[PDB]
């Protein structure tokens, strides 16, 4: 958990780096297509971060499944599926 946490924070540090980069590009009147390229890179990084958190969550649901009971499993999977739907709509 500690290793995964450190890795998540490092991914978000990178992303905030990208967003600071975007501000500097806008400030410096950088050609809009070059900015769009960096926007797409930042969105991709966020998506990759989201998938890593989802995978870790699903792994936990697997680890704990025998303790939870059918109702709680169904509710966790319904919730994850909804989060996946919201992710898909970006």
């Amino acid at each position: 958990y500690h290793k995964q946490k450190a890795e998540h924070l490092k991914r978000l540090r990178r992303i905030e780096g990208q967003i600071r980069g975007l501000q500097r590009m806008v400030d410096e009147d950088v050609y809009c297509i070059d900015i769009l390229t960096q926007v797409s890179a930042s969105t991709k990084a966020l998506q990759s971060f989201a998938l890593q958190l989802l995978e870790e969550h699903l792994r936990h649901c697997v680890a704990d499944a025998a303790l939870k009971g059918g109702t709680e499993i169904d509710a966790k999977v319904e919730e994850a599926t909804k989060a996946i739907g919201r992710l898909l709509r970006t």
Copy 2:
């Protein structure tokens, strides 16, 4: 499994209907923005179909982890996460 199969087939019949609709739109020189609106409708229906299949599979995976114990179903979680990543690009 048999009811879900019927429901999967009905979704796909409607999607094929939408694609035939796109064909007729193109054939009839319909304004391209209206055509794009229908492309969005079709991709949305495909994504909704994907999410239904995903929910059912993830339900099976976690239920199977409860019945069998251990974390071997983690392989299936990783495979699902890769599938979601592919959906997210497209």
Copy 3:
């Protein structure tokens, strides 16, 4: 316009082929991850089709702005941008 129309129709024939393929996959109880891979392939082909239509329309819009002058085609730009936004959600 006639050649582009032919090329639009051929893209859509192939997409309908893919959807019939999904139907047979479901009908034959194919493993759901393989089915998702084909859903991704179909959504990707739809997006590629959308981008072709968009390129052609934006070419027309800018060429028409050159021939006529002024900025009245800005309405068409806003309408296109809204179409792209809809595609991006789906």
Copy 4:
């Protein structure tokens, strides 16, 4: 241009705010679904920012179209279409 610039910077300030929020959530071991919700909000904001820059760019291509010539119009539209494709793949 100055008003659009200020508006772009304000949008990116908001987004960096969101990313700082994500770091705090991870730091505080916030439930992963709540984090995913905020990831999706941040990706959506980036997409909305990208669309605003694209619209502004297309408006400029319209304003300048009579000065540019057919070759340069085609190249600008091809480039925008590619950027739109890259946007779609997030």
